Design a binder for this molecule. Structure first.
Ligand SMILES: Oc1cc(O)c2c(c1)O[C@H](c1ccc(O)c(O)c1)[C@H](O)C2
Length: 156
């Protein structure tokens, strides 16, 4: 089946600035997030269909995660990707998609609309553990990119 979850987060950063920064996430996330060590493009031009390999060290163990870029809509401040291999993908799941969309806040800040879609193989049940881990990932990225912009005011 498909399980869909929707969430919102807020930032004082205007959406156009945040979105520019999101485009540099491969560069930014290893600096801010302790566990991420590198992000490498296995193949692709960074657009839809690109495959990325993330190298992380978790619990003193090196591991890898695979991402695939689904779609990009700059006019709409959206970036979509799916987890398609690695530890992040549970055995039951076909695929886990994270959609990120940025909207102007009422006060000029930003609202991040985060949608998580969990595709399960057959009738398998989604792991609660993964979802909990899942909601954090959607947030952490956003915070990572936000923190970086706030800490480097002149750059964006
Ligand atoms: O705290 C974490 C832990 C993780 O395993 C990850 C986190 C944050 O965010 C990473 C991340 C997510 C999206 C990206 O585009 C990216 O470059 C890096 C990834 O989800 C894997």
């Amino acid at each position: 089946g498909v399980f869909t979850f929707e969430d919102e987060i807020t930032s004082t950063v205007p959406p156009a600035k945040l979105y520019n920064a999101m485009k540099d996430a491969d560069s930014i996330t290893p600096k801010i997030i302790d566990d991420v060590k590198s992000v490498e493009i296995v193949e692709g031009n960074g657009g839809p269909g690109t495959i990325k390999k993330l190298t992380i060290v978790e619990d003193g163990e090196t591991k890898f995660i695979l991402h695939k870029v689904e779609s990009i809509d700059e006019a709409n401040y959206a970036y979509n990707y799916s987890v398609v291999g690695g530890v992040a993908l549970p055995p039951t799941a076909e695929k886990i998609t994270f959609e990120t969309k940025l909207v102007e806040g009422p006060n000029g800040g930003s609202i991040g609309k985060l949608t998580l879609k969990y595709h399960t193989k057959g009738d398998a049940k989604p792991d609660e553990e993964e979802l909990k881990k899942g909601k954090a990932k959607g947030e952490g990225l956003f915070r990572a990119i936000e923190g970086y912009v706030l800490a480097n005011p002149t750059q964006y």
